[PDB]
Amino acid sequence: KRVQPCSLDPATQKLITNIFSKEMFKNTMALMDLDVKKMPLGKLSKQQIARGFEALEALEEALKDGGQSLEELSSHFYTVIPHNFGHSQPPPINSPELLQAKKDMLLVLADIELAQALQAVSEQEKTVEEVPHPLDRDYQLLKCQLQLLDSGAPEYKVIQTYLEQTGSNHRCPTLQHIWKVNQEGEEDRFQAHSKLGNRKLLWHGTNMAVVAAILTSGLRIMPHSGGRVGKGIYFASENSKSAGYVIGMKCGAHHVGYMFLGEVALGREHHINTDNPSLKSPPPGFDSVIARGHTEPDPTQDTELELDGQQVVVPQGQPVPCPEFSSSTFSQSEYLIYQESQCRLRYLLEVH
Ligand SMILES: COC(=O)[C@H](Cc1ccccc1)NC(=O)CCc1nc2ccccc2c(=O)[nH]1
C-alpha cells in the first residue's frame, strides 16, 4: 500500500496533528479528571455516553421523594464514567451548577468519541491499494476546507485588531495563523437566513478536543446543553470572554490554543441583564437573545466585511463602559442564537 505525499502546508500539518492527536484527547480527559486507564480512548463509545447522560438524567429528577438517594445515583454515574480521584470515595452531585458541569464534561467526550468514530477505516479504503498521507486523510475526514491566510488579505488586519483590542490586556493571545473556514453542507442552511440581517462576526472559544467535531458538524445545540442563558450557541464580542474556555496545551516553551470566528445572523435582538438558564429560544418576533455586559467594544470603532455578498459587522475597538447595563449580572456580553442554521464558521485562529 503506497503512502502518498502530504499536500498540506506546515501550518495545516500542525493544526491536523494537534486536533487529531490521541495524546491531546487523552490529556483533555485527564484534565476533566477522567480515569483513562479505566475508560480508554478506543473503548469510549456512544452507548457509554448515553448511559452517562441517563445517570445524570436520574440525578436531575432527584434535585427537582421515596426513591434512591443523591449519593446512590451519583455512585452509578461514577461506575459508568470513571474518574481518577486517587482511589478515594467520589463526591455526590448535589447542585444545578455541578449537574451542568458534569453535563458539559460529557458534551466534550461526545466530540472526543465523534473524532474517534470519524477516523474509522472504511472498506473502500481497504479494497484500494494506495493510502493518502495520514495528515491528508484526517483533513479529508473533516469534509471542511481550511484556507491559511497571509498579511496581504482584506480580512487579516481586520481580525488582528479584533483579537488585540478585545483580548485580555495582560494575558494577550499571540496570533500565529488564520484559516478561512468553509464547511460543505453548512453553506445552504445559512443561505436561507438571507432575509435575516444584523450580521456580526463574533468569537467562540473551545478546548482543542472539540475543534475537529466543529470542523465536521459545525456549531450545534446539543441535547443536555445549556448555561447562564439557555440552550443556544454562545458567542462573545470580547476575545477575553471566549479565551477563558480555551485550555492552553503545553508544547515546549509555548502554549497551543485554537479559536473560532463564527458569522452570527442576529436579526431583531432581545437584550437582557439577568441570568435565565430556562431559555430554549428567544421571545416571539425576536431571533437572538443577547446578555448585555458592563463593557463592550465601542460600536463607533466598528468595521464591516463582504462575506458572500452580505455585510457582517466586525467590532475593532477596545471595550468601553455601558451605563444602560451598568447593573447587569454579566460583566461582558454573551450572544445567544437558538437555531444552528443562523451560524456559519468563518475563521480558525492559532493563538500562543
Ligand atoms: C470544549 O468546548 C468548550 O469549551 C465548551 C462546551 C462545549 C461546547 C460545545 C462542544 C463541546 C463542549 N464550551 C463552548 O464551546 C462554548 C464556550 C464558550 N462559552 C461562552 C459562553 C459565553 C460567552 C462566550 C462563550 C464562548 O465564546 N465560548
Give catalytic status of residue 334 as yes or no: yes
Rounded Cα–Cα distance for residues 70 and 15 (Å): 42
- Taking the CB of residue 62, how many other CB atoms lie within 10 A of it? 18
Rounded Cα–Cα distance for residues 258 and 19 (Å): 9
Of 208, 210, 219, the residue with max ligand 1 atoms within 8 A of its CB, to mutate for a pocket test, comes to: 210
Which of 277, 266, 250 is closest to 335 using CA atoms? 266
Beta bridge partners of 312: 199, 305
Pull the grid cell for residue 142.
473533516
What is the phi/psi pair of residue 341, to 5°? -55, -25
Torsion-angle region of 334 (φ positive above 0: left; ψ -120 to 50: alpha; else: beta): beta
- The separation between CA 254 and the C-alpha centre of its own chain, rounded to angstroms, equals 22
CATH topology of domain 1-142: Poly(ADP-ribose) Polymerase; domain 1 (1.20.142)
Which of 260, 299, 283 is closest to 336 using CA atoms? 283
Q: Is the distance from the beta carbon of residue 108 to the nearest atom of ligand 1 less than 6 Å?
A: yes
Q: Is the distance from the beta carbon of residue 205 to the nearest atom of ligand 1 less than 6 Å?
A: yes
Could you tell me the distance, in angstroms and rounded to a whole number, from the CA of residue 77 to the centre of ligand 1? 23
Beta bridge partners of 305: 312
Crossing angle (nearest 10°) for helices 134-141 and 10-19: 70
Choice among 113, 155, 263, 334 that is catalytic = 334
Residue 104 alpha carbon, nearest atom of ligand 1:
6
Pull the grid cell for residue 172.
494577550
CATH topology of domain 143-352: Phosphoenolpyruvate Carboxykinase; domain 3 (3.90.228)
249-251/269-272 β-pairing:
unpaired
Residue type, 44: L
Of 206, 217, 279, the residue with max ligand 1 atoms within 8 A of its CB, to mutate for a pocket test, comes to: 206
Rounded Cα–Cα distance for residues 260 and 179 (Å): 10
> According to the 3-state scheme, what is the secondary structure of the chain?
CEECCCCCCHHHHHHHHHHCCHHHHHHHHHHCCECCCCCCCCCCCHHHHHHHHHHHHHHHHHHCCCCCCHHHHHHHHHHHCCECCCCCCCCCCCCHHHHHHHHHHHHHHHHHHHHHHHCCCCHHHHCCCEECCHHHHHHHHCCEEEEEECCCCCCHHHHHHHHHHHCCCCCCCCEEEEEEEEECCCHHHHHHHHCCCCEEEEEEECCCCCHHHHHHHCCCCCCCCCCCCCCCEEEECCHHHHHCCCCCEEECCEEEEEEEEEEEECCCEEEECCCCCCCCCCCCCCCEEEECCCEEECCCCCEEEEECCEEEEECCCCEEECHHHCCCCCCECEEEECCHHHEEEEEEEEEC
Beta bridge partners of 265: 199
Residue 205 alpha carbon, nearest atom of ligand 1:
28
Of 211, 245, 260, the residue with max ligand 1 atoms within 8 A of its CB, to mutate for a pocket test, comes to: 245
User: Could you tell me the end-to-end alpha-carbon distance of the chain, in angstroms, rounded to an integer?
Assistant: 38
CA-based max dimension of the chain: 67
Break sites following residues in the chain (C–N > 2.5 A): 64
Rounded Cα–Cα distance for residues 152 and 248 (Å): 28
Crossing angle (nearest 10°) for helices 96-118 and 46-63: 170
107, 222 contact by CB (below 8 A): yes
Which sequence spans correspond to the domains of the chain?
Answer: 1-142, 143-352
Which of 25, 22, 26, 210 is closest to 111 using CA atoms? 210
Beta bridge partners of 291: 272, 334
Reported resolution in A? 2.8
Could you tell me the distance, in angstroms and rounded to a whole number, from the CA of residue 210 to the centre of ligand 1? 10
